[PDB]
Design an enzyme around this catalytic site. Sequence first.
Site, short mmCIF file in Angstrom:
data_model
loop_
_atom_site.label_atom_id
_atom_site.label_comp_id
_atom_site.label_asym_id
_atom_site.label_seq_id
_atom_site.Cartn_x
_atom_site.Cartn_y
_atom_site.Cartn_z
N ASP A 43 -13.92 -4.22 86.49
CA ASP A 43 -14.04 -2.95 87.27
C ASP A 43 -13.07 -1.89 86.47
OD1 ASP A 43 -14.60 -1.98 89.30
OD2 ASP A 43 -13.23 -2.72 90.81
N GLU A 85 -11.92 -14.46 88.94
CA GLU A 85 -13.39 -14.49 89.23
C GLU A 85 -14.44 -14.80 88.09
OE1 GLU A 85 -13.93 -10.53 91.09
OE2 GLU A 85 -13.38 -11.46 92.92
N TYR A 119 -14.95 -10.53 100.45
CA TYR A 119 -15.44 -9.10 101.00
C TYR A 119 -16.63 -9.80 101.54
CZ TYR A 119 -12.70 -7.53 97.12
OH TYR A 119 -11.68 -7.37 96.52
N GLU A 164 -7.64 -11.21 97.53
CA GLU A 164 -8.27 -9.98 97.53
C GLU A 164 -9.05 -9.68 98.76
OE1 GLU A 164 -10.73 -8.68 94.39
OE2 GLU A 164 -9.44 -9.20 92.58
C1 LIG Z 1 -18.76 -4.44 85.49
O1 LIG Z 1 -17.62 -3.88 85.95
C2 LIG Z 1 -17.82 -3.73 87.27
C3 LIG Z 1 -18.23 -2.43 87.43
C4 LIG Z 1 -18.47 -1.90 88.66
C5 LIG Z 1 -18.49 -2.92 89.88
C6 LIG Z 1 -17.99 -4.10 89.77
N1 LIG Z 1 -17.80 -4.75 90.57
C7 LIG Z 1 -16.95 -5.82 90.72
S1 LIG Z 1 -15.82 -6.33 89.75
N2 LIG Z 1 -16.95 -6.49 91.90
C8 LIG Z 1 -15.99 -7.68 92.27
C9 LIG Z 1 -15.22 -7.47 93.53
O2 LIG Z 1 -14.09 -8.24 93.55
C10 LIG Z 1 -18.04 -6.02 93.17
C11 LIG Z 1 -19.43 -6.85 92.90
C12 LIG Z 1 -19.27 -7.88 94.05
C13 LIG Z 1 -20.44 -8.48 94.23
C14 LIG Z 1 -20.53 -9.68 95.09
C15 LIG Z 1 -21.53 -10.34 95.16
C16 LIG Z 1 -21.57 -11.48 96.30
C17 LIG Z 1 -22.59 -10.09 93.96
C18 LIG Z 1 -23.97 -11.20 94.37
C19 LIG Z 1 -22.59 -9.30 93.43
C20 LIG Z 1 -21.50 -8.63 93.22
N3 LIG Z 1 -21.40 -7.59 92.28
C21 LIG Z 1 -20.44 -6.75 92.10
O3 LIG Z 1 -20.36 -5.82 91.18
C22 LIG Z 1 -17.85 -4.54 88.44
#
Ligand SMILES: COc1cccc(NC(=S)N(CCO)Cc2cc3cc(C)c(C)cc3[nH]c2=O)c1
Lengths: 603, 603
Positions: free
Chosen positions: A165, A415, A470, A506
């Site tokens: 992120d 993660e 989440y 988290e």
């Molecule tokens: C590449 O860098 C980036 C850029 C923008 C957003 C993100 N998001 C991130 S790290 N998160 C992790 C939160 O701890 C959000 C997130 C959650 C998620 C949950 C599920 C259940 C599924 C199926 C798919 C998901 N996809 C996501 O993206 C990463």
Amino acid sequence: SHMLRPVETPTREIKKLDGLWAFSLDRENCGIDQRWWESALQESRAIAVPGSFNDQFADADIRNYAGNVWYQREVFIPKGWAGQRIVLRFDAVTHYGKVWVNNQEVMEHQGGYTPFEADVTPYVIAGKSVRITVCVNNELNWQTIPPGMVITDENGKKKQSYFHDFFNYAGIHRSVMLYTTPNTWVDDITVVTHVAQDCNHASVDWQVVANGDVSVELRDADQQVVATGQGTSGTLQVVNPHLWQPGEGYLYELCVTAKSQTECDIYPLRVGIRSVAVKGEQFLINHKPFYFTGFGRHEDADLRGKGFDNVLMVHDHALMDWIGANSYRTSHYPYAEEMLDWADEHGIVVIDETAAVGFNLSLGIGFEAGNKPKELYSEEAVNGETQQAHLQAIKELIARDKNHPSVVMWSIANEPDTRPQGAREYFAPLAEATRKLDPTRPITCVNVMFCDAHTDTISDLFDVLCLNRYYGWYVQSGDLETAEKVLEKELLAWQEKLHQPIIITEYGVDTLAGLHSMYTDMWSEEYQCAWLDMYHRVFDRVSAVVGEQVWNFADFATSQGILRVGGNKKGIFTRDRKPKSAAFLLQKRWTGMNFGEKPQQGG
Amino acid sequence: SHMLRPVETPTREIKKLDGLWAFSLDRENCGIDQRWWESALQESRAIAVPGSFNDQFADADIRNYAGNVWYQREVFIPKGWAGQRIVLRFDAVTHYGKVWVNNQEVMEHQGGYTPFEADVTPYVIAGKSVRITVCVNNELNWQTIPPGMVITDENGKKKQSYFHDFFNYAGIHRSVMLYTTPNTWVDDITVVTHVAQDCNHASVDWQVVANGDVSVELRDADQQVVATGQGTSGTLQVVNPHLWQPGEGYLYELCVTAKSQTECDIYPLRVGIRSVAVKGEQFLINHKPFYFTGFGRHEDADLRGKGFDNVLMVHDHALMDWIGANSYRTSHYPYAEEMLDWADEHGIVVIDETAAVGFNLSLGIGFEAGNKPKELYSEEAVNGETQQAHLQAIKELIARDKNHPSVVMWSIANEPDTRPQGAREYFAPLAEATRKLDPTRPITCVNVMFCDAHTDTISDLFDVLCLNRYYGWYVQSGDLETAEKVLEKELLAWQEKLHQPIIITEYGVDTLAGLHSMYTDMWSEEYQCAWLDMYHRVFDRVSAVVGEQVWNFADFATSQGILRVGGNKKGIFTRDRKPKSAAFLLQKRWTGMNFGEKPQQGG
Ligand SMILES: COc1cccc(NC(=S)N(CCO)Cc2cc3cc(C)c(C)cc3[nH]c2=O)c1
Ligand SMILES: COc1cccc(NC(=S)N(CCO)Cc2cc3cc(C)c(C)cc3[nH]c2=O)c1
């Protein structure tokens, strides 16, 4: 190799952090071939160190740059430094550095969050000026510790993509320094405190040494010599002591003497008498049932990047102290050591973490072009090197932080996807090797919500259960009512599966400061409050839940995307540290409890 | 049936959109069982009509309700209405509505956006007071236009899900009214205006009457009788004319008289003399290439939802006039007829659109796995019945709007997924039916970007190519350089594929008012400015591009999710109509061009 935190007695430093260095981009990558470091960078400009290079200039082209950049500066070596050991140290160099003292290549480093140093005596002359040139790389690839992929376009330029992120800040993020040692010198130390039902207890020294005999002495808070040991290799002193505790954090000082017939080297290593380990579903510090509060944090702030900063540091801790945090985690990379020294000093509990983030390819959110490797563990994507590069990253953090009492736990990664195949084969060795590096503290790997209690193939290999969840936000979006079920259901389902102690590392929702809603819905301040209320209601109905750390202490910057409104807005505080209405809800819960104490499954 | 818009001539309205009515939910679904129309509603609170019901009470539970609600109200039939045809008319009831006059069911309509009326004389007594209950339903299914899926959890609690952005607001959104005619009355009229290199021409006329001889006269702006006609269902009138023209929309008035031996009826229909046609890659109005500027808009505002409102209408039109917009599309559903009378009178060009958005199962937000029929065009999902309900939606829309000279084309649907085979099977007969229904205007179907020039299976069946494009924002996020190459290559592919006129009917980016940035990256005002500007550079290079309608006039409420920060922020204005800095960018581009005319490829 061996890392020892500089302090100032038979050793003294010129910090070179004196900020303004000469700076330039090398858009042609002709810099090494043209031997830039032999004379003054041309076409340069002033930059400050420490801080990220990205945001100092308000320029998108520099901010999104990928490749090598050059830092340069000159500095007189202090006359008094005689025939002494001269040592150049960087607390971090984000991603990769190579260093030229005048024309001598003195250093090389991959890793962006840990120190590296070199003896420079032979190409330096005390009392004279010497050029310092650093080459800095911010590129990530598969054997790198966050991994990533650089796409070179057809048109000449690089462009970085990666899987976490937080934004890819790079540069000299921490103090540099020139420092001095006697030719006799302590260069390594290790210390272990055992505790016994709270009456009395013992600490072990072990110490590698530049040639010389060690007198080891442990001092009081008030400098009364209450522990003494001899031997340059090992001891244990059993004194009946005053412990390192969370409310208050007491510390001893163990001086370390290395002797020659010409010389003497004196070292004070702060020491906290504390025991850490797990018992069943309980977390134990000095054999007590702890309860964790506080956040996941980042090293992020306006203007400076992930660059270190004293004021920022002093203010954030004031804020954490006020709101009831007893603990936090070094979210997704090793932090500057000063945070840890402060944590020890102030008795703050720290889950220390490596830069191993983004092993995961499902995460995510892609409307765009797929590739992207097909198999996560492959020679293509996460491979032999990568486990080795990763191994090395775990050495260093432990090399650095084994002596910090505030660290009650190690975190291997955050993660990773554990649904693909090699996922247990990759993770088992490092889990073993971790304890072969430090058996005094428990170890975890932080868990993404889609490797859920029925699918995640890796959790037994670790000591404590660290979950990022989440439930009303990414799924069940907006629905506290069904979100509470899924969450509890899934917390109970973990409790029986593993019968380990559980911490949520988290839990949080994007919230725009100033967005207010009578309908209490997503992105509103009220919603954040209701959603935190609920997660809370649910840890109060679970015995295995012994830790809670909020997603983000404050809003930070991210990669540009559709899911990030000018960054991650999941802070309790805005990036300029203004509190969202949820700072005051966490305030009540966190100071209302007894210290280190879960409620009566109620309050 | 036949639909004419009520006006005051022999004819007379009593508004009754006097808006204080009684109101309640029906949560256990008792309403039709217990014959609620029979007795004054119980536990009933005051609500304003017209308005959406969801937002007037600041209650999440009412806002997110799915099921049935009731509006009740007493009225007075004017004593004067003695021998009279008394009609009860609703301009819209969102989704379905069923109507009782004092225990006498008079109507039922499915559709949320067009009127339905019943001749109610025999269930009312002139000069007495009546009770009127409306049962309104806001649920969607695979046969409703638009489509959706209600999900009932294990508890029997219904939850609506749908495949479009905007919030499902429901309620009586437009005026209700009792109105009067004689027993001889005009109930349908149709006008076609012809023109030839612009010096003089005719208007065919078709007139259906309730029991009478019809005569017809064309009165001028200053009210002088420019021509005359006799005959019932057929006439044609010739004229040396001031055409209705995008700038100013000059209007003659056609005067319809139905004569019995005893009784008489008079109906004024505003007429704008103008031709509309596609000729190759051009869109001709009065035989001149025209260039659209302006917005896709929504019916949305604080508190009232989609409720119609006069002040709001006058204000948005001052805004669009100021900003230089010469047109819009009734994004997503038919708008309040008032909106079209305004257009008629001020010479605003309109693209009139059905409520058939959501045909696509591919614009998901991420990762709530389930679960949606796997075949879009299947008996489970979008089937023969749906196509009927769709054809019906087309009929009702055209019946309403066919004499509006401001309407220059019909859009049949917005962003259907056209990849699955049978897409073409489903749309060809709708395309065909629509042309037969009105042969006088070009026809379109708005195109979603992942159906692209190489994958789309439907666009040859329509006259004008209308594209919704998001390069730089949903795809190539943040990257203008590469968004721009892809936009141009794609627009050229479409031009060469179909050689039709291209109107971009959506282009825009989410922009948080007040988020400012030197980096010109994604959610800031500066990005909104730079992005629209890049889009503009490319349009001016492509000769088939004949129009531009920026995606949002103003921010609007959506259902909750991670992609919508309290709604869609692609607004040029905020929901409270405050300008973002892109407002002044558009103002300069649009008032600086020659009226109605594509730039010269240059500033
Ligand atoms: C590449 O860098 C980036 C850029 C923008 C957003 C993100 N998001 C991130 S790290 N998160 C992790 C939160 O701890 C959000 C997130 C959650 C998620 C949950 C599920 C259940 C599924 C199926 C798919 C998901 N996809 C996501 O993206 C990463
Ligand atoms: C609140 O109602 C909701 C709920 C959930 C999601 C959305 N998203 C919507 S409406 N769009 C608008 C599309 O015009 C974003 C979108 C773009 C897109 C582009 C490509 C190229 C592909 C392959 C897939 C895509 N999928 C998308 O979803 C709206």
